[PDB]
Symmetry: C3
Subunit: 82 residues, 3 copies
């Protein structure tokens, strides 16, 4: 019941593209919340729970490779108990 | 100092008052709600409830899941954090 | 391939947005995220999330906000750890 929580915080423009990467990669779902900040609720925070670290890592590695340079994004991973 | 538990519940908006009732009636210090959307559209809510005792978190959790999980789209998980 | 970073959360009334933001930046944080929130102790609270690679940085921010506002406003704070890619700077 120990799963991994992937977080992606990125510009709101990427809502469909990032949720595509999540859905296709095989995640059972995702959560998304409106967010603001610096680095106006112009961003979104993705939360993807996955049964395996490797899946979380694969989603993050694709999102980062495709979008980290041309859009402002951060991402991190933690573990939770389900 | 002091390790507390973070119970997260994600359910749809209409359970807001019934779930908050369960949290308060279980004797939690309080709770935090954020608006959220997702797939498993922004008419779901995310509860976060922090508790000194994993006991308290687990009861609140089972009582919510018993009453509503089968009939409503709903997820939950627990982690630990460091409070003051 | 991963590095430990600390995540500081502060939940306060929305009116404290400008003051708390300024305390985060003045301590040298690379950034912060804010979400709108409601709760009990409609979305008239705010949740800050501040990631940093030094627990000392997180401790300074937390100590200053607690000292300044936790008497006069209803707030909570906590800290946990997360993992980030080494390639990223926090
Ligand atoms: N794997 C997952 N990761 C993160 N959030 C999820 C996951 N599965 C379900 N959820 C959340 O739980 C909610 C249940 O109802 P919804 O499908 O409307 O929206 C869902 C998401 O917000
Ligand atoms: N035990 C708890 N778990 C989660 N959040 C809390 C808890 N106690 C207080 N809070 C949050 O702290 C906030 C302080 O102001 P409010 O009472 O408006 O709303 C409160 C909640 O958002
Ligand atoms: N150190 C940090 N802690 C928390 N959030 C951050 C940090 N750095 C950047 N962010 C978030 O990542 C977002 C990236 O785009 P923005 O610059 O619009 O706003 C940023 C913040 O919301």
């Amino acid at each position: 019941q120990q799963v991994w929580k992937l977080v992606i915080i990125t510009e709101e423009i990427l809502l469909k593209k990032v949720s595509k990467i999540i859905k296709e990669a095989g995640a059972s779902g995702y959560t998304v919340l409106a967010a603001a900040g610096e680095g106006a609720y112009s961003n979104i925070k993705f939360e993807v729970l996955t049964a395996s670290r490797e899946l979380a890592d694969q989603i993050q590695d694709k999102v980062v490779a495709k979008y980290f340079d041309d859009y402002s994004c951060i991402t991190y991973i933690s573990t939770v108990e389900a």
